[PDB]
Amino acid sequence: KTEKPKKPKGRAYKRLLYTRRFVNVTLVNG
Amino acid sequence: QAIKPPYQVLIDTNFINFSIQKKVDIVRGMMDCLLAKCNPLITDCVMAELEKLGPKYRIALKLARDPRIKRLSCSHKGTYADDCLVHRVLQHKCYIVATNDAGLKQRIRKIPGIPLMSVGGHAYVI
Amino acid sequence: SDAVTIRTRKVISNPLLARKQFVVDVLHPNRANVSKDELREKLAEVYKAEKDAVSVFGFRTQFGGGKSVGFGLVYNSVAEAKKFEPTYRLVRYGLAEKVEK
Amino acid sequence: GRVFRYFGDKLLISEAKQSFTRVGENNLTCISCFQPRLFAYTVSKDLQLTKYDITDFSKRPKKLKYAKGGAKYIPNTTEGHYDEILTVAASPDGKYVVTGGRDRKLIVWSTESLSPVKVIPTKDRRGEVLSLAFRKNSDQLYASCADFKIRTYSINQFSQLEILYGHHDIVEDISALAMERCVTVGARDRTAMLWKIPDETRLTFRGGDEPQKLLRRWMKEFFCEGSIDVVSMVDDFHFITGSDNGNICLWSLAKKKPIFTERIAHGILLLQPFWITSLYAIPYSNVFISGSWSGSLKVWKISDNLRSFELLGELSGAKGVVTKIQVVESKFRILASIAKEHRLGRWIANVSGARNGIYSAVIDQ
Amino acid sequence: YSTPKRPYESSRLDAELKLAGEFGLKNKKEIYRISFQLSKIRRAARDLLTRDEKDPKRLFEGNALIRRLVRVGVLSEDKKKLDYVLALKVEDFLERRLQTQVYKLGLAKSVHHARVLITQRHIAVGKQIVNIPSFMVRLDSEKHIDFAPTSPFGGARPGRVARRNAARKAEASGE
Amino acid sequence: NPKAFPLADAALTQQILDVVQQAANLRQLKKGANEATKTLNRGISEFIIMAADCEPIEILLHLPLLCEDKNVPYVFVPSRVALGRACGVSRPVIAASITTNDASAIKTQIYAVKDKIETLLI
Fold it and tell me: What domain range is F6 assigned to?
């Protein structure tokens, strides 16, 4: 057993991922 | 991705000779696994190739010249069904490729966002 | 104590049981699941007999709250409540002894 | 009950007694008259209720008592109105009369000493009172509300009964009879609905007949329905509505379509038809009175077969925006609340004879 | 429900999260089940495109199916020719969810803030408090969507954390 | 010569009044040719509604020039009174502007109205 993950659960993990995806997307297309 | 019905699809040379020799229709098969109204296309490169299979394949030619299927034109003397489509799939992002040729199929999986087909109207996503 | 407003419908004269049957409607905004005792008090003042001449039961409330519908009874006399009512309701209302066995 | 009083022919219309009173208020919104001696109650956009005695038919309404609020009653549990009062309704026992308006409250008043006996918060920022209508010989208040609601109260006990939902714009007009049902309009949704209170059901009748088809009529031989302004209930089996283009629609409870629609009534003046700004029927009769700002109350007689209606006439004694019609009897006394503008605070154009007051008209037999 | 044919495929996998990014969901189960109902309609939709014109099957089982799509609030009435039914897509059922209609109607300033406001005994549509985000509004219930009589933002109580904030002021500053 | 072109027919006029009614319900509406001109400057304006009974009419002729510069649709309506009424507003509004929002609940109605207007402009 490890105390390593602190990362959120359920809905809050999907919100952050979407924001990161949008940021990544802005660069390559722009 | 932003692709909407009615879909538009490109019928190359390898497709029709897998349709008749498995007795599955062109247009009515395309309405099956795409589940909407389909707009088939054939280019000048593909049709004039089938005149060279003429005395053994009148059957494929007399099906392709039906008003269910539409006319499409390109302007190059010497191009193929194989290479002329890849330029069509390149400069626009809203066609669907129908084929079974693996030599063409590896040129389709590289460009993202391009729908493929299968054995005669049994579709598969990108 | 929020202007209880007990509404009655379906009143039929039943003289062969010497009674009047009617559906009690209990509107209760900002008040939840009032009683069986206060209901017998507050519908006996439109018929003007007595509290123990009034029987009532039923009352599955509306979902969420604010309305309650049961089934109500009124008789002509006190002795009729001792004859025409069921034996456990009189124990429930208080008008009898339940001989446990 | 059905229509049985047949006296449209008995009305002597051409020599009806016409008179007018000027009053000390700007923009009277409504008028409500009690019949058990007869009383009258007026509210204005000058924040005032005024009580008149109208038991003497030959006289103009003389002043009994009057009450005006002010800016003291800014909060909403204050016992006074602090904005425009849009409607007023008297209780059938002659004991109370309730007012309400843009201050989004309901203040029940005593008829005797003219005192605020009750104030009720509507508890919504969009719960503006628009029309109050009492069931005949009852105390169950039907409250049209601007948050698309119908709120039902009791008067003697001052409680809340239940609320009807369903409309899509602001419920302007609601009318009722002695049974437990009412007619409502939503006044931009271009429909009307019948409301059965214990059944908790509605029957939805649809206007919005396109004038384009009427242009087909123009090939066989107009103006748009945009706002069903008023609704009135003649009997328990039929009713009527008034529109924004002169059409007055007769409706049957067995007919989804309009069983009749009258084309342009108060007329026009590209061109602009007058609005049907008032509509009041004599109960269980075949006679009803429609009013505009055009200057003449047009009165109509329902046919016996409930299929069409015909002109009784015009009464030209009332110039200005007719907001509300009251009719009492014994003979008949007609009162009309004439304001300088429309009820809803709306804009009015170039009105000849800008005046404020009460129209009276006595018709014999 | 039904699982899709391929579980991991690039142009569809990123097409998941751009649906999860706009609408703010939590499970592709809540995506797949929506496509599942759209799957069953669409097979039936192609059935009445084969049969004869003005078939009463194409009338009674066609137009009522058409009107029910107008009744749920998805098919606009201009496209009422049974040929837009094939041109339906996934987001239109997602658009009629109770969660997303809150944000469109002001009042939420997010699609994730409205998700929290569903499950905290707040906003009702009729007189029934709705606390399931997939309530599927029927287009005759839009302008009844509003804050509750109770549960502040609607008034008449400030609530257990506002009353506790009031409680702190009276005990240290006052008495 | 006409100065009142294009002027809408009946059911399109009531259709527009209903769209303006829900737009005033969703605060997505501008009131006044001053404000409408400012929205045409900021490029946020979807389309412009002008009245035909405004006296004088020549105060409202700047909006077709500015819209045709910005390629923005516009259609005259006959009443300024009803055009005021559809604002949820009890005094007349001579000209109204529709603002841009892709998060708008009423967006399909706006695209259908722009379909009718852009159909009539050609």
Answer: 1-122
